[model samples]
Target: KVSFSDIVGLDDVKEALKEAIIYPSKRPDLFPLGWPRGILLYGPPGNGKTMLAAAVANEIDSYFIHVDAASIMSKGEAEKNVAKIFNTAREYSKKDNKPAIIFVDEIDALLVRVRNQFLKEMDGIMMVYVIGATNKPWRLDEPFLRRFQKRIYVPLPDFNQRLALFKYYTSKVKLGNVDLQELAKMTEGYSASDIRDIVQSAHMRVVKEMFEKNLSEPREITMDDFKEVLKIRKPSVNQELLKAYEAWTEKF
Candidate 1:
């Protein structure tokens, strides 16, 4: 089961998600106070929007279904597929007596590409909880956005979060003595996925060298390996994208 502790950062976002989604399942009495079923999580790509959804599904012990542009086969078929998913989710919810979550990744595509009726299905579902994730929140239609009562911003990791992420991701590996704070500082704008790529790349390089030299076993990951990666690997989130995201959040 997914817990808040599983996620490295976004403490506020996690709490909000739990309050809106998780708490309702355990404490239905609180519904008198008002609770929203739909939650929108938008942020830069690879910042753990999908991961957070997985965590929620784990925590709730719900059937998690992922939807995207590619999942829609044809314009005519949208309603059918959508109905089937929710119907099945309802069945599961009734049988298991747990909430089901339909996570729509890049939901803007559905707003733009599919029929409005498809979105209406999302608006009408009662038993199934809907969580939509998108990097381009600006592209989402207002009606679709309105269906979600809470809009959460999962921003890029700050220095402390990044350091924690580095530690978390590399926890299984043998890391040589290195200043993680310095590494975190160096990766100012890196997403969680980007840091994972950097670590995996470093590990891969060390493994490659070991194989090339015919070493008996792998060695501990040293800071030099990480430095080499830092020298060559640029952060995926550019300044323009950061500005655009900030502007979108400001306007929203």
Candidate 2:
């Protein structure tokens, strides 16, 4: 059910992904090396990396194989674990004749702790696509890093995106009055989830008021309710993290 339209921002990233995943799946012969051997999505947390991967898999009707590499590293069994992942993928893509996507979250761990095993298994997975996601892309080793042909930076929603997000989330609730454009301007550092929580907290406040007054119907949410929530809740990612991503993308 999820389409690219369902996503809020990062328009460029979505287009690149369409070429990397969607187009290649539609016509494998158009590519130089077949489909991309690997693709990497990096950014501060709670943006839309996972959502992008899911949207791609859904659009292409591919099997989404999600693996959290950080937890796999803790098991210290990535050698066979990687093997099992590729093993299932092999059967699904080759024998079953379907597309499969291996989405590795916290992928920097896989590169740092298990690059050799990962690369060894990756060399032959031609039919399956490997899309690795991480917050710490710089933590990856150069040897393993070269395996990814396309590296994208997922970013916090810009003003336009935040405005659209406000409209989208607020559609579920009774909007008494609030200039979404004005609200977007105020949420300079907020992530999409932060915006959702801000809206949620305001809705909760109205419900709380309804219970207190024993009203027949809940009151419509207004700008003041949002201001109250905004006063306390702040962005999760700070200036330092934002600056770090900027520098990393420029250099890398």
Candidate 3:
């Protein structure tokens, strides 16, 4: 159900993905070279990767299949599972007259043998997209690096994004007037995870405040509610963690 608007920041990455998946998925005729057969997305956990990924999933009109590397690497059937996924994708592409998108999770864990099968499936393919995500791209399989046509970095949500995501999340709900810009200004150092949870925490805060007043007469939400939560949660990824990523990514 996640869509682009629900995702904050990462406009650069978004456009690249849309170009990689969205643009070609809709009008294959325009792309003579065709869309990216394999795409790479690198980022840490809860760094808006889920929302960003889910948005892509929702947007891609093709038959989308999500399979984790761990699941595919189960026992001695690793290559079998890999083959099965590609075969399954092959059928949908050929029989149904539609493309197949395989969103592979933790792509770093796939064995070299599995990669051999993976390399073959990709080498022998059409209209099948392999979108890979990883937490540790630096330590990921060296041979697997070049497979993804585009290795886009999904960085933390920035200011405009922090402000943009503020009310879009609670768009359907009614609340006491709150300045969206200030919320971003207030949570300057917080990553998307902290900001993502702020919405939930705000509601819980409002409910608790309502509890103290009257259960029958619930008070409307307020900036005080969200700001109250922001100070409570603080930043999950601080300076060093943020700096660590900056120290890297020069190669990309």
Candidate 4:
């Protein structure tokens, strides 16, 4: 079991995904004909949206098929790709006799109602369950937005999540002890993915230093390590992006 233990602070996101996966598996009597799935996880880049999808696939041992616009656009036409994806998902689902999750990672690129043909292509497919992840959901047209049943806004990690993440990563090392609350307080605008990179880089620094010193284990990471990490690493989203997000958020 790839424990949920390491997935420290995304409780709400985890719960939502849990429902999305479990409801179909547990209640075939209700959805006896076909599995029901329609999810859209929209957030800034570097968050764990993709990771969450992977975890779901792993948890259920389901076939995970990823499709997006560029792939759809490159192959003949939009309608053709959509139809193919649906058919392929069905085949895989039948062969596995398990839930098949069709994850269209950057769907806003093609699924948007930018043209009537796109709408028609989307409307044509019915069997496949599409769980799309996008960072630009606001840019999507009304018809496209309306098609998705669930829309979850994944904003930057709040203070508690940041603290939990800090504690989780720091505990992996044997070095200098650090303060979680202090780190969390400083990481206001940092997204979860950005935080992962920061921790990874810091861990690498510590590991490298230990190797150079010929020490078996580096000292526990201190507050200084975190401070240094911040100096080199910053949040991926800037003020302009936040402003744009805020405006879009106000609309919903």
Candidate 5:
């Protein structure tokens, strides 16, 4: 099934992967190179990194292993478990016989500098294609970064992408008098996921109203509700955060 239609934006990232994996795999003879098995997706929190990875998983017909550092460590035997996970992933890496995707969500924490010296053991079993998502790329160690053949910066949604995100998010509503462009402006610095949270917060007001009225559910969320949500849950990243991010980017 399609993960999402056209997906409104993120064309560059989509196109990058298409050329790197989709096209190369489809025409292996012409490319004649192994796919860049490791890819890094980094950006501010709430940007759509997870969804983008999920969309890739859906499109590729590859087995997706969604792992987090905590869960992998939770079992106590981090090294043994990581090895087994990769071994299992390698076996399933094919439609007929190709490689599958091993998605390590928040991989920076797991592979970042730490007292944990289990990476050497884990390295021996690294055959599966590794796609990692992180909000902080600068925090990751050189060894971990070097393993990845490519690094993709999934930045905050641009104006058009933000507009598309707004449309997709509000499609279910009647929104008769709503102005998405204006709303998008109001959401100026909000990330894609942040927008979703705002929508959800607005929706919850309707839900609360319905519950108070003893109704099963609220019908459609109105523009007023959205306005109220905007008032309530503002984007956390402000000018101060931007300045600090700028400083880091400069040094980085």
Candidate 6:
């Protein structure tokens, strides 16, 4: 149900993905020449990599299957599952006349040798699009990365992005007079997930207080409540990880 518009920030990421996947499916005439078959999204955790993929498929009305590579237990299971995944996707594409997207989450953890086999299988899938997401791009093998014609960097939200995200996540919840821009400024280094945690923490505190008093309605989150969460909800993506990502980008 998540659409591209539902995603708060990362406008560039969304546009890039639309061109790579969505537009190609909806308007294949625009790309009569050719289109990218695979894409790799890499960045820190909780930055909406998976969400982007989900949004693409949702917007384009394509079949989507998301799998966690770490969960593929054995070598035999890996091959069987990989074959089933593409074969099923191919079936869906044929039935609906819509492209199918196969999303592999944390694909860097997929066994290196086996990963190549998956890539080899991709060669025969005509209309299916493969998207691989990983927090640790440096960990991925060169040949594996090469399969992805487009490699995108999904960085943490900047100031404006963070502000938009804060407002979006809190849209359904009641709030006291709190400055969203100020909150965004204070959460410079935080990822989208970290901001979500802060919002949830604030909500939880308000709910706890309401339950203790047996109140019918909970107190709205105020500036003070947000400040309290901000004090303790440290940014998840540390300086070291940022540096590592930068170095990896440069090297790659």
Collision count for each candidate, in order: 0, 0, 0, 6, 4, 0
TM-score of each: 0.88, 0.89, 0.80, 0.74, 0.81, 0.90
Pairs that collide, model 5: 93-98, 93-99, 93-100, 94-98
lDDT of 3 by residue, 1-252 (tens): 778876656779999988988888788799997656888888755666555666776787567788898778775588888888999998987898877888888887774688788888877773788888877777665566767777878876778877776766667445788788888888777766677688878877767767897776556778878867866797876677666566556765
In the range 121-229, model 4's lDDT, one tens digit per residue, is: 4454443456788888777777776656666666678887788777766677654666678888989999887777778887888888989999997766667887898
- Model 5 C-alpha RMSD to native: 3.4
Worst 10 residues of 2 by lDDT: 108-117
Alpha-carbon runs more than 4 Å astray in model 5:
1-5, 33-35, 112-127, 172-176, 211-220, 239-252
- Weakest 10 consecutive residues of candidate 5 by summed lDDT: 112-121
Q: What lDDT would candidate 1 get against the real structure?
A: 0.82
What is model 3's C-alpha RMSD? Answer: 3.2
In terms of TM-score, which candidate is strongest? 6
- What's every prediction's RMSD, in angstroms? 2.3, 2.2, 3.2, 4.2, 3.4, 2.2
Over all chains combined, what TM-score does candidate 1 have?
0.88
Mark the regions of model 2 whose C-alpha exceeds 4 Å error after superposition. 33-35, 76-78, 111-113, 213-217
TM-score of 3: 0.80
Cα lDDT of model 6 by residue, 16-125, tens digit: 88888888888888998888888999999999888888888898888889988888645466778878888899998899887788999988887455676788876776
lDDT by residue (1-252, candidate 2, tens digit) is 577878776879998898888898888888876657598999988877888898998988888899998778888566778888988887888787778889999988865446787887777774798999998888887777778878888888999899998998899999886899989999988998899999999999999999999996779999999999999999999999889888877877
Better of 1 and 4 by lDDT: 1
lDDT of 1 at 42: 88
Candidate 1 wrongly placed segments (more than 4 Å): 73-75
Model 3 ranges off by over 4 Å: 1-9, 24-35, 50-60, 73-77, 111-116, 172-174, 209-214
